[PDB]
Amino acid sequence: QPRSHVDCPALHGQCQSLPCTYPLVFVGPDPFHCGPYPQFGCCA
């Protein structure tokens, strides 16, 4: 499944404008799992 590859919701990270500034790191293009907008990157 998609969630298995990306634990965006399971981890509950934050969507920010890439690149993902450490310690956080990019996990995958998760539009639904975003704060301001889906365009952002689901940083975990």
Please answer whether residues 32 and 2 qualify as being in contact, where contact means their C-beta atoms are separated by less than 8 angstroms. no
| Tokens coding 32 | 């639904």
Please answer whether residues 37 and 23 qualify as being in contact, where contact means their C-beta atoms are separated by less than 8 angstroms. no
Residue 15: its H or E element: strand 14-16
Adjacent-strand bridge partners of 32: none
| Torsion angles phi and psi, residue 16, rounded to 5 | -130, 165
Amino acid at 41: G
CA 28 to chain centroid, in Å, comes to 6
Experimental method: NMR
DSSP secondary structure string for all residues of 1-44: -HHHH--HHHHT-EEESSS--TTS-B----SSS-SS-TTSEEE-
Domain ranges of the chain: 1-44
Amino acid at 21: T
Name which of 19, 17, 7, 14 is nearest 34 in CA terms: 14
Return d(Cα 18, Cα 34) in angstroms, integer. Answer: 13
